[PDB]
Design a binder for this molecule. Structure first.
Ligand code: ZN
Ligand code: ZN
Lengths: 163, 163
């Protein structure tokens, strides 16, 4: 079969029993109580050993992923098949990449749970493949304004010169 | 729907037609002439846009991946289902992680093609699931000698500090 999917491990919102299937074919069960998920799976799957849960189109359950705000990068789906990469520096966020040049984009990042992917871990059951990320000489649209790649999001207060 | 696997892109040894399948379901064909690969795949698969080839148990064909030596890290299968992580610094290699404590390991690294994984890109058609990498207070073996995780391979000239 295929290699195992890099699973998610962190706080979950709402309790219950989560179900999913890893690309290696293994079925993984996550019992969520008080925000913590206990993993049950085959010794054959990597997620079992890491105590992680691979979120797929195969994932089932009532609980929701609740990622920590201190990620490095995230994949943000700003259209049905288009993404933008969000790089985090301290309290600020910068659009460091885009699947297409001139993609429209919101002026504020959402909560981590709204990202399709965070530091390599998928969080959504629905995720279109991600075309190559364009990180230079391209721009994104926030309303009617244009911003060169690498620009922090428009509605974010600029970092003062305190160092 | 599963995420696309990160595919290999680089020199191959031996010419012929390579065939494989991405976890996303896409069939991918790689045409190799003079160690170079032309990719034929669906616009729906990430490997198609990157012009990469996902090596799996579903991989078929006469060619062998021929990775570059300037890699940073790599998974080295040193048992049926055990791994050691290799980090490279210049011309030196260090066992920077392991699947289970006290794994017997060779004294020097092989050509990159013998690594199950190189910088997150699978190279082997056969790759058991990799358990969490123990990177602290654990040791590995080389013949009859024990080494603390982090030490460079015994059969390599040990450089001076500050070098
Ligand atoms: Zn698995
Ligand atoms: Zn694919």
């Amino acid at each position: 079969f295929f290699s195992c999917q890099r699973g998610y491990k962190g706080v979950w919102r709402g309790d219950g029993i989560m179900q999913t299937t890893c690309p290696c074919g293994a079925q993984i069960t996550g019992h969520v109580k008080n925000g913590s998920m206990r993993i049950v799976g085959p010794r054959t799957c990597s997620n079992t050993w890491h105590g992680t849960f691979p979120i797929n189109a195969y994932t089932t359950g009532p609980c929701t992923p609740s990622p920590a705000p201190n990620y490095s990068r995230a994949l943000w789906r700003v259209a049905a098949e288009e993404y933008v990469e969000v790089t985090r520096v301290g309290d600020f966020h910068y659009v460091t990449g885009m699947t297409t040049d001139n993609v429209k984009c919101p002026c504020q990042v959402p909560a981590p749970e709204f990202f399709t992917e965070v530091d390599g871990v998928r969080l959504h059951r629905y995720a279109p493949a991600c075309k190559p990320l364009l990180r230079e000489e391209v721009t994104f649209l926030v309303g009617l304004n244009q911003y060169l790649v690498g620009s922090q999001l428009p509605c974010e207060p600029e970092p003062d010169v305190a160092v």
